[PDB]
Amino acid sequence: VNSFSGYLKLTDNVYIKNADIVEEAKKVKPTVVVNAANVYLKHGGGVAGALNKATNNAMQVESDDYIATNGPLKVGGSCVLSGHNLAKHCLHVVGPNVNKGEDIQLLKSAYENFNQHEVLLAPLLSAGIFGADPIHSLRVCVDTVRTNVYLAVFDKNLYDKLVSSF
């Protein structure tokens, strides 16, 4: 388990790799994989859809059961559920959607959830459809997370740009 290889060290605790997070999760068998979730844990696209498809919808069934007890997650909030075949645990984290005018400060709250886990495989939060600058998101991760975080970035152009910022 936690067989991370081929990562570039950015800080004492933050690593980055140009990788498909699902492919990495299958290879690393991490204790925790982070999902970039919405408040309803509807895993319909992006990283969430890829992770859920890799579990053959087990993640979605379990998420639905969780939401049935909890109701929607709060922006900046998270929940710990099964990682199924991808990890021991999946940390589902909701970053702000700045397209809805949600405060970018809630991205710190979002990354603060990582501090409850000694090692995580994660994507960058609040990028793509959540509209945050991904370089800004990596800055918040680096400033906020004190446990060991291994970031997978799929897009090589984005990866090059992030690495070029350290």
Side-chain angles (χ1 to χ4, degrees):
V1 287
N2 299 300
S3 316
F4 296 94
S5 62
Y7 286 78
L8 173 60
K9 198 162 162 105
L10 295 180
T11 65
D12 291 308
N13 67 297
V14 180
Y15 303 79
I16 192 165
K17 190 184 188 172
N18 178 215
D20 167 339
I21 191 172
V22 169
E23 200 177 18
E24 269 305 284
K26 284 210 278 263
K27 164 178 211 163
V28 164
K29 295 268 173 298
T31 305
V32 179
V33 61
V34 176
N35 186 24
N38 52 61
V39 296
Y40 292 113
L41 298 184
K42 295 305 187 184
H43 309 308
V47 169
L51 289 169
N52 178 56
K53 182 168 151 204
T55 71
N56 308 106
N57 214 54
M59 175 176 288
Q60 189 61 72
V61 167
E62 185 203 21
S63 299
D64 284 352
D65 181 71
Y66 177 79
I67 292 304
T69 74
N70 182 73
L73 273 70
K74 292 256 168 59
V75 178
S78 68
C79 63
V80 177
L81 295 176
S82 176
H84 303 276
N85 48 305
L86 300 181
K88 188 159 142 62
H89 304 292
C90 177
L91 182 68
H92 299 270
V93 181
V94 185
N97 187 345
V98 304
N99 298 126
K100 292 167 160 189
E102 301 177 345
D103 175 13
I104 198 55
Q105 200 284 142
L106 285 170
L107 187 52
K108 167 169 194 311
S109 178
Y111 280 117
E112 186 62 46
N113 295 293
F114 289 26
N115 287 333
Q116 277 55 261
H117 307 275
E118 80 194 344
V119 63
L120 312 90
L121 172 58
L124 290 172
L125 297 179
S126 284
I129 68 152
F130 273 16
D133 166 53
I135 314 182
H136 178 68
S137 186
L138 174 57
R139 190 65 58 193
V140 176
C141 182
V142 159
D143 294 343
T144 308
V145 181
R146 289 205 318 291
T147 52
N148 296 312
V149 40
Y150 291 82
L151 294 165
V153 179
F154 181 62
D155 186 300
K156 177 62 153 79
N157 286 325
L158 175 51
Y159 171 82
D160 292 351
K161 185 167 285 167
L162 293 167
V163 169
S164 298
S165 302
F166 285 74

Coordinates of all heavy atoms in Angstrom, one line a residue, residues 105-146:
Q105 N -11.8 31.7 -0.3 CA -11.2 31.4 1.1 C -11.7 30.0 1.6 O -10.9 29.4 2.3 CB -11.6 32.5 2.1 CG -10.7 32.5 3.3 CD -11.1 31.4 4.3 OE1 -10.2 30.8 4.9 NE2 -12.3 31.1 4.3
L106 N -12.8 29.6 1.1 CA -13.3 28.2 1.4 C -12.5 27.1 0.9 O -12.6 26.0 1.3 CB -14.8 28.1 0.9 CG -15.8 28.9 1.8 CD1 -17.1 28.9 1.0 CD2 -16.0 28.3 3.2
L107 N -11.6 27.4 -0.1 CA -10.6 26.4 -0.6 C -9.6 26.0 0.5 O -9.2 24.9 0.5 CB -9.9 27.1 -1.8 CG -9.0 26.1 -2.6 CD1 -9.8 24.8 -3.0 CD2 -8.5 26.8 -3.9
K108 N -9.3 26.9 1.4 CA -8.4 26.6 2.6 C -9.1 25.6 3.4 O -8.5 24.5 3.7 CB -8.0 27.9 3.3 CG -7.3 27.6 4.7 CD -6.7 28.8 5.3 CE -5.8 28.5 6.5 NZ -6.4 27.5 7.4
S109 N -10.3 25.8 3.8 CA -11.2 24.9 4.6 C -11.2 23.5 3.8 O -11.1 22.5 4.5 CB -12.6 25.5 4.6 OG -13.5 24.6 5.3
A110 N -11.4 23.6 2.5 CA -11.5 22.3 1.7 C -10.2 21.5 1.9 O -10.2 20.4 2.2 CB -11.7 22.7 0.3
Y111 N -9.0 22.2 1.7 CA -7.7 21.5 1.9 C -7.4 21.1 3.4 O -6.7 20.2 3.6 CB -6.6 22.3 1.3 CG -6.4 22.2 -0.2 CD1 -6.7 23.3 -1.0 CD2 -6.1 21.1 -0.8 CE1 -6.5 23.3 -2.4 CE2 -5.9 21.0 -2.2 CZ -6.1 22.1 -3.0 OH -6.0 21.9 -4.3
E112 N -8.0 21.8 4.3 CA -7.8 21.6 5.8 C -8.3 20.1 6.1 O -7.7 19.5 7.0 CB -8.5 22.6 6.6 CG -8.2 22.5 8.1 CD -6.7 22.7 8.5 OE1 -6.1 23.6 8.0 OE2 -6.2 21.8 9.2
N113 N -9.2 19.6 5.3 CA -9.7 18.2 5.5 C -8.6 17.2 5.4 O -8.6 16.1 6.0 CB -10.9 17.9 4.6 CG -12.1 18.7 4.9 OD1 -12.6 18.6 6.0 ND2 -12.4 19.6 4.0
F114 N -7.6 17.5 4.5 CA -6.5 16.6 4.2 C -5.7 16.3 5.5 O -5.0 15.3 5.6 CB -5.5 17.1 3.2 CG -6.0 17.2 1.8 CD1 -7.4 17.3 1.5 CD2 -5.1 17.2 0.7 CE1 -7.8 17.4 0.2 CE2 -5.6 17.3 -0.6 CZ -6.9 17.4 -0.9
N115 N -5.7 17.3 6.5 CA -4.9 17.2 7.7 C -5.4 16.1 8.6 O -4.6 15.8 9.6 CB -4.7 18.6 8.4 CG -3.8 19.5 7.6 OD1 -2.9 19.0 6.9 ND2 -4.0 20.8 7.6
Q116 N -6.5 15.5 8.3 CA -7.0 14.4 9.1 C -6.5 13.0 8.6 O -7.0 12.0 9.1 CB -8.6 14.4 9.1 CG -9.2 15.4 10.1 CD -8.6 16.8 10.0 OE1 -7.7 17.2 10.7 NE2 -9.2 17.5 9.1
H117 N -5.6 13.0 7.7 CA -5.1 11.8 6.9 C -3.6 12.0 6.7 O -3.2 13.1 6.3 CB -5.9 11.7 5.6 CG -7.3 11.7 5.9 ND1 -8.0 10.5 6.2 CD2 -8.3 12.7 5.9 CE1 -9.3 10.8 6.4 NE2 -9.5 12.1 6.2
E118 N -2.8 11.0 7.1 CA -1.4 11.2 7.2 C -0.8 11.2 5.8 O 0.2 11.8 5.6 CB -0.7 10.2 8.2 CG -0.5 8.8 7.6 CD -0.2 7.8 8.8 OE1 0.1 8.2 9.9 OE2 -0.3 6.6 8.5
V119 N -1.5 10.5 4.8 CA -1.0 10.4 3.4 C -2.2 10.3 2.5 O -3.1 9.5 2.8 CB 0.0 9.2 3.2 CG1 -0.7 7.9 3.4 CG2 0.6 9.3 1.8
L120 N -2.2 11.1 1.4 CA -3.4 11.2 0.5 C -2.8 11.2 -1.0 O -1.8 11.9 -1.2 CB -4.2 12.4 0.7 CG -4.7 12.7 2.1 CD1 -3.7 13.6 2.8 CD2 -6.1 13.3 2.1
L121 N -3.5 10.6 -1.9 CA -3.5 10.8 -3.3 C -4.6 11.7 -3.7 O -5.8 11.4 -3.3 CB -3.6 9.5 -4.0 CG -3.8 9.5 -5.5 CD1 -2.6 10.2 -6.1 CD2 -3.9 8.1 -6.1
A122 N -4.3 12.9 -4.3 CA -5.4 13.9 -4.5 C -5.3 14.6 -5.8 O -4.1 14.7 -6.4 CB -5.3 14.9 -3.4
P123 N -6.4 15.1 -6.4 CA -6.4 16.1 -7.4 C -6.3 17.5 -6.8 O -6.6 17.6 -5.6 CB -7.7 15.9 -8.1 CG -8.6 15.6 -6.9 CD -7.8 14.8 -5.9
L124 N -6.0 18.5 -7.6 CA -6.2 19.9 -7.2 C -7.7 20.2 -7.1 O -8.5 19.7 -7.9 CB -5.6 20.9 -8.3 CG -4.1 20.8 -8.3 CD1 -3.5 21.6 -9.4 CD2 -3.5 21.4 -7.0
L125 N -8.1 20.9 -6.1 CA -9.5 21.2 -5.8 C -9.9 22.6 -6.4 O -9.1 23.5 -6.6 CB -9.7 21.2 -4.3 CG -9.5 19.9 -3.6 CD1 -9.7 20.0 -2.1 CD2 -10.4 18.8 -4.1
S126 N -11.2 22.7 -6.8 CA -11.9 23.9 -7.2 C -11.5 24.4 -8.6 O -11.9 25.5 -8.9 CB -11.9 25.0 -6.2 OG -12.7 24.7 -5.1
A127 N -10.7 23.6 -9.3 CA -10.3 23.9 -10.7 C -11.4 23.4 -11.7 O -12.5 22.9 -11.2 CB -9.0 23.4 -11.0
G128 N -11.1 23.5 -13.0 CA -12.1 23.1 -14.0 C -13.4 23.8 -13.9 O -13.4 25.0 -13.9
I129 N -14.5 23.0 -13.6 CA -15.9 23.6 -13.6 C -16.1 24.4 -12.3 O -17.1 25.1 -12.3 CB -16.9 22.4 -13.8 CG1 -17.0 21.5 -12.6 CG2 -16.7 21.7 -15.1 CD1 -18.3 20.8 -12.4
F130 N -15.2 24.3 -11.3 CA -15.4 25.1 -10.1 C -14.7 26.5 -10.3 O -14.8 27.3 -9.4 CB -14.9 24.3 -8.9 CG -16.1 23.5 -8.3 CD1 -17.3 23.2 -9.0 CD2 -16.0 23.0 -7.0 CE1 -18.3 22.5 -8.5 CE2 -17.0 22.3 -6.5 CZ -18.2 22.0 -7.2
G131 N -13.9 26.6 -11.4 CA -13.5 27.9 -11.9 C -12.3 28.6 -11.2 O -11.9 29.6 -11.6
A132 N -11.7 27.9 -10.1 CA -10.5 28.5 -9.5 C -9.3 28.3 -10.4 O -9.1 27.3 -11.1 CB -10.2 27.9 -8.1
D133 N -8.4 29.3 -10.4 CA -7.0 29.1 -11.0 C -6.3 27.9 -10.4 O -6.2 27.9 -9.2 CB -6.2 30.4 -10.8 CG -4.8 30.1 -11.2 OD1 -4.5 29.7 -12.3 OD2 -3.9 30.4 -10.3
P134 N -5.9 26.9 -11.2 CA -5.3 25.8 -10.6 C -3.9 26.0 -9.9 O -3.6 25.4 -8.9 CB -5.1 24.8 -11.8 CG -5.3 25.6 -13.0 CD -6.1 26.8 -12.6
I135 N -3.2 27.0 -10.4 CA -1.9 27.5 -9.7 C -2.3 28.0 -8.3 O -1.6 27.6 -7.4 CB -1.1 28.5 -10.5 CG1 -1.0 28.1 -12.0 CG2 0.3 28.7 -9.9 CD1 -0.1 29.1 -12.8
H136 N -3.3 28.9 -8.2 CA -3.8 29.4 -6.9 C -4.1 28.2 -6.0 O -3.8 28.2 -4.8 CB -5.0 30.3 -7.1 CG -5.5 30.7 -5.8 ND1 -4.8 31.6 -5.0 CD2 -6.7 30.4 -5.1 CE1 -5.5 31.9 -3.9 NE2 -6.6 31.1 -3.9
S137 N -4.9 27.2 -6.6 CA -5.3 26.0 -5.8 C -4.1 25.3 -5.2 O -4.1 24.8 -4.1 CB -6.1 25.1 -6.6 OG -6.6 24.1 -5.8
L138 N -3.0 25.2 -6.0 CA -1.8 24.4 -5.6 C -1.2 25.3 -4.4 O -0.8 24.7 -3.4 CB -0.9 24.2 -6.7 CG 0.5 23.6 -6.4 CD1 0.3 22.3 -5.7 CD2 1.3 23.4 -7.6
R139 N -1.2 26.6 -4.6 CA -0.6 27.5 -3.5 C -1.4 27.3 -2.2 O -0.7 27.1 -1.2 CB -0.7 28.9 -4.0 CG 0.0 29.9 -3.1 CD 1.5 29.7 -3.1 NE 2.2 29.8 -4.4 CZ 3.5 29.4 -4.6 NH1 4.2 28.8 -3.6 NH2 4.0 29.4 -5.8
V140 N -2.7 27.2 -2.3 CA -3.5 27.0 -1.0 C -3.2 25.6 -0.5 O -3.1 25.5 0.8 CB -5.0 27.1 -1.3 CG1 -5.9 26.8 -0.1 CG2 -5.4 28.5 -1.8
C141 N -3.1 24.6 -1.3 CA -2.7 23.2 -0.8 C -1.4 23.3 -0.1 O -1.3 22.8 1.1 CB -2.6 22.3 -2.0 SG -2.1 20.6 -1.5
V142 N -0.4 23.9 -0.7 CA 1.0 24.0 -0.1 C 0.9 24.7 1.2 O 1.6 24.3 2.2 CB 2.0 24.5 -1.1 CG1 3.2 25.1 -0.5 CG2 2.3 23.5 -2.2
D143 N 0.1 25.8 1.3 CA 0.1 26.7 2.5 C -0.8 26.0 3.6 O -0.6 26.3 4.8 CB -0.5 28.1 2.1 CG 0.5 28.9 1.2 OD1 1.6 28.5 1.1 OD2 0.0 29.8 0.6
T144 N -1.7 25.1 3.3 CA -2.7 24.6 4.2 C -2.5 23.2 4.7 O -2.7 22.9 5.9 CB -4.1 24.6 3.5 OG1 -4.3 25.9 3.0 CG2 -5.2 24.2 4.5
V145 N -2.0 22.3 3.8 CA -1.9 20.8 4.2 C -0.5 20.5 4.8 O 0.5 21.0 4.3 CB -2.1 19.9 2.9 CG1 -2.0 18.5 3.3 CG2 -3.4 20.2 2.2
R146 N -0.5 19.9 6.0 CA 0.7 19.6 6.7 C 1.0 18.1 6.7 O 2.1 17.7 7.0 CB 0.6 20.2 8.2 CG 0.6 21.7 8.2 CD 1.1 22.3 9.5 NE 0.5 21.6 10.7 CZ -0.8 21.7 11.0 NH1 -1.6 22.4 10.3 NH2 -1.2 21.1 12.1

